[PDB]
Amino acid sequence: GGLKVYNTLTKQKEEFKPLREGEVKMYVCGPTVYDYPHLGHARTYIAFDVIRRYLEHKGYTVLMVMNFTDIDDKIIKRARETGEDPKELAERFIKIFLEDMEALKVKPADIYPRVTDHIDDIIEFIGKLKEKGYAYEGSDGIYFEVKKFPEYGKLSGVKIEDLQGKKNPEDFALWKKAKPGEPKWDSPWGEGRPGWHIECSVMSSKYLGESFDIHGGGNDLIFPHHENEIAQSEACFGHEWVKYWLHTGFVMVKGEKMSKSLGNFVTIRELLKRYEPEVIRFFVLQKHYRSPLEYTEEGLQHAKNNLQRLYNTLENIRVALRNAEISYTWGELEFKTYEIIREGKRKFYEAMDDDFNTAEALKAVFEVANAINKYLTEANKPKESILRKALEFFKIVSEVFGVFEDYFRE
Amino acid sequence: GGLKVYNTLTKQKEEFKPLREGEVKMYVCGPTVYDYPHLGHARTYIAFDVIRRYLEHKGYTVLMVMNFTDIDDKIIKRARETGEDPKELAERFIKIFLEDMEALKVKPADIYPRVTDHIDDIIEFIGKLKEKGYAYEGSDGIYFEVKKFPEYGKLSGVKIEDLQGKKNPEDFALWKKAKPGEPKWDSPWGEGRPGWHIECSVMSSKYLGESFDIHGGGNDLIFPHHENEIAQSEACFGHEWVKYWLHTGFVMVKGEKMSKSLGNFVTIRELLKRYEPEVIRFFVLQKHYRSPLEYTEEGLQHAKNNLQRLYNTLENIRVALRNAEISYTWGELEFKTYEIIREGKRKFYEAMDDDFNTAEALKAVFEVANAINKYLTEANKPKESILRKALEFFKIVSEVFGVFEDYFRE
Ligand SMILES: [Zn+2]
Ligand SMILES: [Zn+2]
């Protein structure tokens, strides 16, 4: 009956037990700030925001850390294309991303560590990796050696043999020596930049300790990004680093993966010009977070229509509460409605406890809404207690899913 | 650890396991509506409202039924004194009690059954008792026989030998034949009125099923009222009737019990004329619901001062949130404040799980408030995440205790 989560590390559903009672330390991989956020970022971060909201709803104190990679080769390439500075562009798109997450009613992360503010910690981490023998120096930087970590391939399941101044093809850069014209920082191994995988591990170990509960990200990050993270962390610490791994499914456009490389990406700013943020949240939440999400305009229209139906139900409840009277007795209709509301709340909690299955939770919500509409149609004089219980259930739904916020604000 | 409640039937703390998953059926003995409510009713109903709020906060659907004894010999006495019809006085004081409970921010019960609306059910229950060999017909009505029920006295601990148209002194009235000038109802045993004990059992069995979870009331209701209800229900049904019995402690005035018999009672409306509803709620919640409450003006002043301190803390948080910035990193002060807030929430839940101990919960609340005041004093630029977590904790406290309503409603 407890909350179970799907662990990608074991590829199975396990009962959720945090390391420290009453606290969930969750880390999610933030976006790379070089262009406007698209629907994949919205899907991933809305799913993890709903996970955070539900964990807080169950009584946990959630410390959520989302990194802000503000230096990368893609960022430098974009700055060179636009003739800007790789830092001004990063700051501008960090602000754009924060505004977009604020618009989508996503709760801001508790800490937003930046790479440029944690260079020394990364350098110390790479030095500690080198003194343990897990790193070597190449002609163009410091590289991590995969074969010295026997448990490589634990998360994704990719074998080393399949992967086969870098010694081995499967090795990866921990510190890259600087090219002329690009940003760089002083280091004992030469002036350069950090790698694309050391940053998240360094920030997570700095702000959450050597071990925390939940590491999150996109499904593409399973390999090589998160495998690199777990390899580096267990090489540096020698013990388990992340207890539960959560990955959101891909967003699909006409049967292919949504990404900026193929150019089939729709920005959040573009969607906001056509749909309300709660409509986008409902469209994201209509599918399980591990399942692929097919992006169609008809799907968004259907989500809009369903959200409008729920809005109409809430407005009808509000209107009926103006003339609702106290119940000195309950008929068969009142007991039927109460039973449906109670069963809907139980099914909502059961669905959210089953790997955050928001689809069944929405099914329960719609069952409760249909029952309330039937009760308001059939009851000659609506009872105040029934409407109050319905509003309590919808308030729980609002707190968990982040919808109906304007209705319950008033 | 799960939620534990103090069962008076076993006189010990037991893990709270409802009969049906996700549903708690609670029954509270209502007030005798013939005079203005006093502080004892406020204490009892505020304690049970906090219990209901916490049970709903834990995910349970709570169906709470509070009965109304609109016909009573004391009501007839007051009606004869005032020269008013008993029913009109009963209805007027029903309205007065509802207004007083609405003022005290007490959530209304789902069902409010009335004795005058359930005469036929009471007659059916008495007939079922008679045909089961548990009641007899006396000179002035129908009386329940205690000797037929061997388990009498398991709640209050009172022995039958200590208690020794009634066959036995320990017998009690089930139906009382109508005296001239009194309201009367037709019955197979003659015109009369129901007793004060049959109503609660009849209404509870009617609206909460055959057996429900929680039966509540004052400490004076342990004997004879609730023992009589146990006897009637277990004689009529032949199985367990109530799983958990909760009784609020007495309210003391100058070391003696407060009741209208001694004339040392203060009405709720007088305190409302002198204090705010949340101050009265805080004063009630300063002590455990099972512990006696000493009514002093200095105690109310201290509760008002503590609630004003909490209001000042919330106002400081609100003011600081206007200039609060996001967190790119956390210093030792931010981590210390976060740790204290997390531990305060954990201790709040641990205290409320320990037989609804509101005193320890309030101590945790004040610890969190002191920590956040210290943080706002020593923070040169407060972080938005820390203030948001503090506001979430205080929102949980507001939802459970029913205080801070104005701050979070706006
Ligand atoms: Zn990462
Ligand atoms: Zn009673």
From Swiss-Prot, chains A, B:
It catalyses: tRNA(Cys) + L-cysteine + ATP = L-cysteinyl-tRNA(Cys) + AMP + diphosphate. A motif ('HIGH' region) lies at residues 31-41. Belongs to the class-I aminoacyl-tRNA synthetase family. The gene is cysS. Binds 1 zinc ion per subunit. This is Cysteine--tRNA ligase. A motif ('KMSKS' region) lies at residues 257-261. It holds the Pfam family DALR_2.
